[PDB]
Automatic annotation (TrEMBL):
Keywords: Methyltransferase, S-adenosyl-L-methionine, Transferase. It comes from the Bacteria. This is Methyltransferase. The keyword Transferase applies. SUPFAM superfamilies: PUA domain-like, S-adenosyl-L-methionine-dependent methyltransferases. It holds the Pfam family PUA_3.
Length: 376
């Protein structure tokens, strides 16, 4: 079809294994939504790719060879992604995890999650969306035993896709504890599976006997995890009224008494001021602003750290999390340092995407989750 000659920079990245086609490296592109063949300036074949706008990307490399995107091509892709996850589908301690993660599984633009007996497809660009029938057909052959499927449009945003319908809300298990989720209500599902290992640490006792403040709680999944790990008390703060019922659902599923678990609906900065006013301090403060115009991580994260430190107990901990794909680990660390000023602190750990949210090893920028555990 269209033979796209690429620049020197675009070339080295392609040869290095970078699948994402950055807008910055394809400045004057007049093409879109179609399969193309990439060539160097020396007229050498670099691979098969598809174009479609996706945030800062203009497309994805499909393969370094000449191939066509038919149903068989996707069957092969899903067979490989499935084989790498045998241990997940095996263990019943976690029944919700990611089955396919864009370039981490060699096909950017598509993610697929499993939530118990149902699956959730997510389309990140119009191109994959237009060819989704073959993609789904291929998936159903490789994973024939799911009861039903739903889809999210990430570019109506949610819809039932195939098979049986799922209860509007149901429970899944993660790290052996229950969480309430929903598959056909907006873009989100009630939980962010990529933070599973952070919740595991909390359930394990990282906050045992400690008081916890969870900012931008969403559905308070971190709070329930901490509660199951023996936290003395937890306060979950979210700007959305919806957070109440959705948070209660997790606590109820785990039969937890909530005498020492508070759910607050308030702007996070307004809560910082309220806390200062009422002398409220916490041993552990979790900060995880939505990456969904929502809070600017790249610019204002230092404010969350600064104000959080003002209400943090002596020898306390801060768990600074972000799913901002546009921020590097170093850029994030710089925002945290900015908030700390000259107050002494130690970085205890950095956790990023878990194995199911497969990352392209040749492209570390795909590892969007960054969680820093810091002691003061």
């Amino acid at each position: 079809m269209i033979k796209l000659m690429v620049g020197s920079f675009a070339e080295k990245k392609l040869k290095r294994g970078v699948q994402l086609l950055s807008s910055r490296d394809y400045p004057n592109l007049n093409l879109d939504n179609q399969v193309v063949q990439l060539y160097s300036d020396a007229d050498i074949f670099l691979g098969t790719a598809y174009l479609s706008k996706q945030n800062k990307g203009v497309g994805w490399l499909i393969s370094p060879k000449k191939v066509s995107l038919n149903v068989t091509y996707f069957i092969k892709l899903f067979q490989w992604s499935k084989d790498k996850r045998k241990n997940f589908a095996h263990s019943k301690l976690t029944t919700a995890y990611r089955l396919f993660n864009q370039d981490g599984d060699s096909f950017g633009g598509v993610t697929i999650d499993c939530y118990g007996d149902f699956v959730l497809f997510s389309w990140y660009n119009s191109f994959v969306y237009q060819i989704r029938d073959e993609i789904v057909a291929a998936f159903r052959q490789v994973y024939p035993n799911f009861l039903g499927a739903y889809e999210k449009i990430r570019f109506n945003v949610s819809a039932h896709l195939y098979g049986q319908e799922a209860p509007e809300q149901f429970l899944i298990l993660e790290n052996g504890i229950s969480y309430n989720v929903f598959l056909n209500d907006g873009l989100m599902t009630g939980i962010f599976l990529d933070q599973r290992q952070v919740r595991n640490e909390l359930i394990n006792g990282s906050a045992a006997g400690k008081t916890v403040l969870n900012l931008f709680s969403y559905t308070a999944a971190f709070s329930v995890a901490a509660a199951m790990g023996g936290a003395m008390a937890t306060t979950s703060v979210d700007l959305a009224k919806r957070s109440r019922a959705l948070s209660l659902a997790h606590f109820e599923a785990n039969h937890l008494d909530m005498a020492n678990h508070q759910l607050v609906v308030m702007d996070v900065f307004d809560y910082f001021k309220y806390a200062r006013r009422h002398h409220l301090t916490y041993d552990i403060i979790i900060i995880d602003p939505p990456s969904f115009e929502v809070f600017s991580v790249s610019k204002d994260y230092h404010k969350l750290i600064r104000q959080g430190l003002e209400i943090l107990s002596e020898n306390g901990l801060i768990i600074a999390s972000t799913n901002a794909a546009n921020m590097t680990v170093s850029q994030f660390k710089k925002q945290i340092e900015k908030g700390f000023g000259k107050q002494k602190h130690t970085y205890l750990d950095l956790q990023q995407l878990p194995s199911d949210f497969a990352v392209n090893v040749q492209d570390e920028s795909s590892n969007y989750l960054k969680v820093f555990t810091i002691k003061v």
